[PDB]
């Protein structure tokens, strides 16, 4: 199995134009759950989530999300008071875990104020890393509750991973599939005497792809331009890499290596 991850995001907006609160869950790049302050309901985002979780899951987490929504509103008000900020500001949260290919795990829990790092949980020392003195004030208050830190460590290391394993089974046909890339090299004289080489890949799943340009099989070419890995809209992805010009494009995707000699 490849590396997989589970994560839950929260967005809180003060004085919005836009919901006051949104929560979205993901398995890798796939949305799995959604909640907002308008619907006040937690709903599946993936048919394999809807098909496999009974209504009591959605009923229970809707109640929790309504409480988390209220807690987010109060916490953003306290942050604004600490910073002496008026107007519309954002509060964000990300919690999740990763199950690596080798069986080892990672877990993370972070907060952001106005889209910047604010508090970073360290589950190995059971402490919060504060970026400034407002975050330090919150860190001191939160660390006073040792039970909650321990609870968060247990959730990140044990509960999150068990949810991830459960969801990966539910979404097996989507998440554990391989759609190999369609790769081509395009050559063109651009500015006189200048040749541009593009290595373009599309139709692949998962989105994680490695592409590079090599010279005489050995050295990586200096000054490679990389294209972002973009969703094609049909569940597959596209990307590219280019160079100015014996050159070859090297592509690695889900245990398969590919060379396109120019």
């Amino acid at each position, epitope marked *: 199995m490849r590396t997989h991850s589970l994560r839950y995001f929260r967005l809180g907006v003060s004085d919005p134009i836009v919901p006051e609160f949104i929560s979205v869950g993901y398995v890798d790049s796939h949305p799995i759950t959604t909640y907002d302050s308008v619907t006040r309901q937690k709903e599946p985002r993936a048919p394999w989530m809807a098909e496999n979780l009974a209504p009591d899951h959605w009923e*229970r987490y809707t109640q929790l999300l309504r409480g988390w929504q209220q807690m987010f509103k109060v916490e953003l008000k306290r942050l604004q008071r600490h910073y002496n900020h008026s107007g519309s500001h954002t509060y964000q949260r990300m919690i999740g875990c990763e199950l690596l290919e080798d069986g080892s795990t990672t877990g993370f829990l972070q907060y952001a104020y106005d889209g910047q790092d604010f508090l970073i949980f360290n589950k190995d020392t059971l402490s919060w890393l504060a970026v400034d003195n407002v975050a330090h004030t919150i860190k001191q208050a939160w660390e006073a509750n040792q039970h909650e830190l321990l609870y968060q460590k*247990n959730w990140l290391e044990e509960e999150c991973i068990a949810w991830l394993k459960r969801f990966l089974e539910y979404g097996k046909d989507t998440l554990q599939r391989t759609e190999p890339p369609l790769v081509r090299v395009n050559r063109k004289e651009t500015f006189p005497g200048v040749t541009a080489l593009f290595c373009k890949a599309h139709g692949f799943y998962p989105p994680e792809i490695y592409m590079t340009w090599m010279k005489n099989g050995e050295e990586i070419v200096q000054e490679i331009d990389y294209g972002d890995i973009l969703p094609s809209g049909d569940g597959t992805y596209q990307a590219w890499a280019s160079i100015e010009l014996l050159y070859s494009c090297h592509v690695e995707h889900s245990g398969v290596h590919m060379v396109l000699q120019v």
Partner: antibody
Amino acid sequence: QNIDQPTEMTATEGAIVQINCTYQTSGFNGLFWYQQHAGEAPTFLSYNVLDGLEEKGRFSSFLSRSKGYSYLLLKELQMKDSASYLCAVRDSNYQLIWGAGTKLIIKP
Amino acid sequence: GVTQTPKFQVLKTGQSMTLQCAQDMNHNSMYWYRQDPGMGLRLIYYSASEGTTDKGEVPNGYNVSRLNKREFSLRLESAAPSQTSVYFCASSAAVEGGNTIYFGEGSRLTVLE
């Protein structure tokens, strides 16, 4: 989903009693121990979520997550320790599942 | 802590009853439990925060109102002899892990034909 603790336990004054709690839940988000005197409200004793033994005076709370087991250990037993001891486990959906309780009887 | 009333109540089958509960700990979550011999506390209704309530394990014959952040009342619409029990109101800072539950003194209710 089940939480199991003995119905009743009897020990002698000045001795030690270990009250076991086993749980079969889909997930685990912590284990509580409460003390409830006859005709009184339950009162908090401990919360365990990671592995180990936590000592609070004459009372200790142990947890083994892999074994799905906890115990409440009461040392130097006094008559005032005669009460029911309730364990509760928070499951994967944060539902608190309460055990039926253990009535502890102290023989003077 | 948690203040609940009344401590004792005798009701006739079919009568209405409201159990009051308040907490001064600025807690978000509130609960109503019933305690019956030989079984664990059973959740009737809970309120994860102000502005929301939901059914517990034994909601039938009851209803609740989260009046404000402090208050959570339990209503017996048409009391039945099976509703003879000890009722405990409870509160915690949040429903999530670790947060200590605080119980009220308990309400002993007896429903008679």
